[PDB]
């Protein structure tokens, strides 16, 4: 939740949907424990790890493109130092506050 906040960098604040340093508005969050928790894990929701660089406030990226973790030339071909950034989620009824 704190990664949706101004002035921080991470796998979400810069690589999912950037938000500016000058928030105007509100932060609202319904309790998703009884709405968005399912047995076996909510692996439908997916997050990446990095992108090319920082985004701009409220930009859309539905593409799941493979980013270059290292500096080898993928040359349009996935492989060494060209890894999948997306990962799944495990949500369980025994999960803690964190």
């Amino acid at each position, epitope marked *: 939740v704190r990664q949706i906040a101004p002035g921080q960098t991470g796998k979400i604040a810069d690589y999912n949907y950037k938000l500016p340093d000058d928030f105007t508005g509100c932060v609202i969050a319904w309790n998703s424990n009884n709405l968005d928790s399912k047995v076996g894990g909510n692996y439908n929701y997916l997050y990446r790890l990095f992108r090319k660089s920082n985004l701009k406030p409220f930009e859309r990226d539905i*593409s799941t493109e493979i980013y270059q973790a290292g500096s080898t030339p993928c040359n349009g071909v996935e492989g060494f130092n060209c890894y999948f950034p997306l990962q799944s989620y495990g949500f369980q009824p025994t999960n803690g506050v964190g």
Partner: nanobody
Amino acid sequence: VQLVESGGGLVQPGGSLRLSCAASDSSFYDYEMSWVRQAPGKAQEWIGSMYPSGRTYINPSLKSLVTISRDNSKNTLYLQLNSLRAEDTAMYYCVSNWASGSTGDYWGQGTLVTVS
């Protein structure tokens, strides 16, 4: 009628099967057309997805079980089922825009599937 489904039927445990869905025009497939299943009892889940950027990334839990391909001659869409057990009763609908929540999905009639 602008979208149809073809293939499927009884699944002998350990046998192969064929399934399909169709569309109307090339602009209808633009930009996203993702496979999806449903199931009585078992939660609904999306089968396969083909993103318009050229890279296809199936769900990490469902990327090693289903092969997905597209044929635009009939607008058909090959789907295969392999080794269903008694715990996987699924009913298949061809519903688009599931990565948009329950505000962009299109509901029609579909077909009813029972797996014993």
